[PDB]
């Protein structure tokens, strides 16, 4: 429970540096692993994780005075790159304690900064931020993989002004001319990390992770993706859009001109059949593609059963579109006419999945984001209550009918017409009590047509005033995933033409070598930083 604890750990938490220096000098080890249940990840349990190391506690506890003392104390100094059972160094652990509150975020960045210089002063050659925990994550990847907007916003924009501690800084100013100054961000382990690039950790993450849609608004990420978009992804996406439009044009005609006389599989007799079956072949191939391309997705992005509809609503429909295509082949060689049933759901999904390609366009893609939110939020709530009413009042109605609408389908079908403006208040005379039939339909109409549909309009308006920004940021994330799924798939061998940035020598290795870094230029202006 407390397994691994020391009285040194006590003193750091009880605000007692007078006794930390007392315990270390008498030989209290400063590598001790508090590998006890209370000291692990909370996960609901009443705990505090800090890093399973004394130095880690002081960093997560805001005594920078203590922290420095642990590292130049003459009796014994903590190993700066010492990690825990999870593999988390102090900087790793210093991320996992972040919670994206300003009082926390101001501190963690203030502290995270200071262990770096200290480790640089102690060890100009050791690289701390490159260290990886047990899982395979860095402090940068951990911040992005865990939702830590302020830490990430710090690490990327890390401009340090010190003689020996600029090789750690990441946001470099190359030149300046009056109010104009031209910054430089680093892109090391952001676009092409061998393991867990920041982009590939923000985008291939789960909606449980907070602030997925806010992290890409951190500079340079936004500018970086719009650079990949403008350079090579936009052309490929428009091309992917064209092929899918030609696909659906072809699957549409091969469907429209389906044989009607016989049972499948049908015969190549005239020339139009040959030029149609072609389209039918090409129709299936896309389904196989979207099938494999969906299996791929739902393996390498092991989907949380709830996250399917939030993060992956479109992928679900392309996959579902594929399934109806494959069922359409199983049933076309199984001689069953029911291939058409499947085939028509593929078309309808197929054409609606054009809205996928809205994400190459801001105002249309934001609109399609609002659509998928309204579906999952406002419409599902609506249709639930609507069907309770529909089924409630239908049963009532069809129980009153005597004799033909003496069926729960037709009555439910007639009562659904009221909500699409096609309700007859006289669709039956076959009953005994007109007062009942009318009171009941009016109650249905008032509750459903006058109230509930118009309430939905009102609910939607509330939603639109709320998800307006959320939907812009879900849009940019949709486009980000396209940029990443693209640059993988398209290149997948060379990975040299999408190199955002360039070799820009920014400074020097603290030993003295040159500091070459792939860096992203950003041009900026100020009118109050006059110095």
Ligand X SMILES: CCCCCCCC/C=C/CCCCCCCC(=O)O[C@@H](COC(=O)CCCCCCCCCCCCCCC)COP(=O)([O-])OCC[N+](C)(C)C
> For residues 398 and 441, which CB has a smaller minimum distance to Na ion in the complex?
441
Q: Side-chain half-sphere of 86: how many Cα atoms within 13 Å? A: 22
SS (H, E, C) 430-468: CECCHHHHHHHHHHHHHHHHHHHHHHHHHHHHHHHHHHH
Instruction: Return left, alpha or beta for 147; rule: phi > 0 is left, psi -120 to 50 is alpha, else beta.
Output: left
Instruction: For residue 350, give the 3-state DSSP assignment.
Output: helix
Does the annotation place 315 within a ligand binding site? no
Residue 463 in the binding site for ligand X (CB under 6 A): no
**Residue of this chain nearest to Na ion (CB atom):** 421
> For residues 61 and 406, which CB has a smaller minimum distance to ligand X in the complex?
406
- Phi first, then psi: give them for residue 319, nearest 5 degrees: -65, -45
Residue 236 in the binding site for its own copies (CB under 8 A): no
Only one of the segments 66-74, 202-210, 218-226, 270-278 lies at the binding site for ligand X (rule: CB under 6 A); that segment is 270-278
Range 8-18 burial, b when 16+ CB lie within 10 A, else e: bbebbeeeeee
> For residues 383 and 497, which CB has a smaller minimum distance to ligand X in the complex?
383
Only one of the segments 51-59, 201-209, 315-323, 460-468 lies at the binding site for its own copies (rule: CB under 8 A); that segment is 460-468
Residue 238 in the binding site for its own copies (CB under 8 A): no
Residue 412 in the binding site for ligand X (CB under 6 A): yes
Chain residues 188-247 in contact with ligand X, contact rule CB under 6 A: 238, 240-247
Does the annotation place 209 within a ligand binding site? no
For residue 462, give both structure tokens.
Answer: 């509330």
Chain residues 178-217 in contact with its own copies, contact rule CB under 8 A: none
Alpha-carbon span 260 to 461, nearest angstrom: 46
Binding-residue pattern over the window 53 to 82 for its own copies, x denoting contact by CB under 8 A: ---------x--------------------
CA dihedral 467, 472, 473, 477 (to 10 degrees): 130
Chain residues 282-321 in contact with ligand X, contact rule CB under 6 A: 282, 285-286, 289-290, 293, 315, 318
The alpha helices in 14-85, defined as continuous H runs, are: 17-25, 54-59, 64-72
For residue 183, give both structure tokens.
Answer: 């910054």
Chain residues 96-125 in contact with ligand X, contact rule CB under 6 A: none
For residue 180, give both structure tokens.
Answer: 């104009």
Of 49, 50, 107, 498, which lies in the binding site for its own copies, with binding defined by CB under 8 A? Answer: 107
Only one of the segments 127-135, 166-174, 399-407, 493-501 lies at the binding site for its own copies (rule: CB under 8 A); that segment is 399-407
Q: At its nearest, how many Å lie between ligand X and the CB of residue 412?
A: 4
Binding-residue pattern over the window 306 to 345 for its own copies, x denoting contact by CB under 8 A: -------------------------------xx-xx-xxx
> For residues 135 and 337, which CB has a smaller minimum distance to its own copies in the complex?
337
77 binds, among Na ion, its own copies, ligand X, none (CB under 5 to 8 A by kind): none
> For residues 113 and 419, which CB has a smaller minimum distance to its own copies in the complex?
419
Does the annotation place 293 within a ligand binding site? no
DSSP character string of 210-260: TTHHHHTTSTTHHHHHHHHIIIIIHHHHHHHHHHHHHHHHHHHHHHHT---
Does the annotation place 3 within a ligand binding site? yes
DSSP character string of 287-344: HHHHHHHHHHHHHHT---TTHHHHH-HHHHHHHHHHHHHHHHHHHHHTT-TTHHHHHH
- Residues at the binding site for Na(+) are 421
Binding site residue list: 2-5, 13-14, 313-314, 352, 359, 421, 424
């Amino acid at each position: 429970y407390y397994k691994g604890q020391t009285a040194l750990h006590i003193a750091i938490e009880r605000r007692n540096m007078a006794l930390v220096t007392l315990l270390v000098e008498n030989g209290a080890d400063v590598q001790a692993a508090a590998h006890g249940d209370f000291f692990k990840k909370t996960k609901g349990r009443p705990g505090f994780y800090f890093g399973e190391l004394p130095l880690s506690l002081a960093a997560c506890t805001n005594q920078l005075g203590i922290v420095k003392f642990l590292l130049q104390n003459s009796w014994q100094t903590a190993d700066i790159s010492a990690r825990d059972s999870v593999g988390n160094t102090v900087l790793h652990a210093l991320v996992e304690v972040a919670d994206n509150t300003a009082d926390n975020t101001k501190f963690v960045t203030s502290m995270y900064n200071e262990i770096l210089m200290l480790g640089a002063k102690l060890h100009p050659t050791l690289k701390l931020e490159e260290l990886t925990n047990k899982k395979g994550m860095t402090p940068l990847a951990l911040a992005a993989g865990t939702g830590k907007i302020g830490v990430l916003a710090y690490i990327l924009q890390r401009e340090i002004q010190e003689p020996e501690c600029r090789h750690l800084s990441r946001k470099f100013t190359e030149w300046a001319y009056g109010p104009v100054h031209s910054s430089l961000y680093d892109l090391s382990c952001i676009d092409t990390c061998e393991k867990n690039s920041v982009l590939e950790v923000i985008a291939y993450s789960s909606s449980e992770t907070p602030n997925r849609h806010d992290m890409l608004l951190v500079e340079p990420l936004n500018r970086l993706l719009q650079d990949k978009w403008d350079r090579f992804v936009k052309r490929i996406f428009y091309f992917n859009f064209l092929v899918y439009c030609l696909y659906m044009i072809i699957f549409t005609m091969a469907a429209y001109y389906r044989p009607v006389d016989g049972l499948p599989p049908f015969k190549m007799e005239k020339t139009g059949d040959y030029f149609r079956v072609t389209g039918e072949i090409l129709s299936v191939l896309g389904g196989v593609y979207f099938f494999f391309r969906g299996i791929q997705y739902f393996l390498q992005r092991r989907p949380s059963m709830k996250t399917l509809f939030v993060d992956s609503y479109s992928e679900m429909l392309f996959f579902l579109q594929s399934l109806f295509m494959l069922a359409t082949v199983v049933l076309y060689f199984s001689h069953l006419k029911e291939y058409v049933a499947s085939m028509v759901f593929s078309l309808a999904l197929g054409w609606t999945n054009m809205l996928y390609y809205t994400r190459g366009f801001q105002q249309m893609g934001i609109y399609a984001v609002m659509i998928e939110k309204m579906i999952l939020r406002d419409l599902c709530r609506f249709m639930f209550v609507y069907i309770v009413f529909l089924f409630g009042f239908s049963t009532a109605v069809v129980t009153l009918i005597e004799d033909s609408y003496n069926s729960l389908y037709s009555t439910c079908l007639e009562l659904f017409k009221f909500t699409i403006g096609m309700g007859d208040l006289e669709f039956t005379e076959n009953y005994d009590f007109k007062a009942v039939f009318i009171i009941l339909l009016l109650a249905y109409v008032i509750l459903t047509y006058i109230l509930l549909l118009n309430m939905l309009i009102a609910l939607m308006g509330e939603t639109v005033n709320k998800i307006a920004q959320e939907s812009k940021n879900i849009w940019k994330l949709q486009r980000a995933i396209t940029i990443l799924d693209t640059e993988k798939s398209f290149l997948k061998c060379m990975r040299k033409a999408f190199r955002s940035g360039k070799l820009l020598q920014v400074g020097y290795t603290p030993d003295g070598k040159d500091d070459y870094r792939w860096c992203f230029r950003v041009d900026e202006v100020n009118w109050t930083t006059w110095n």
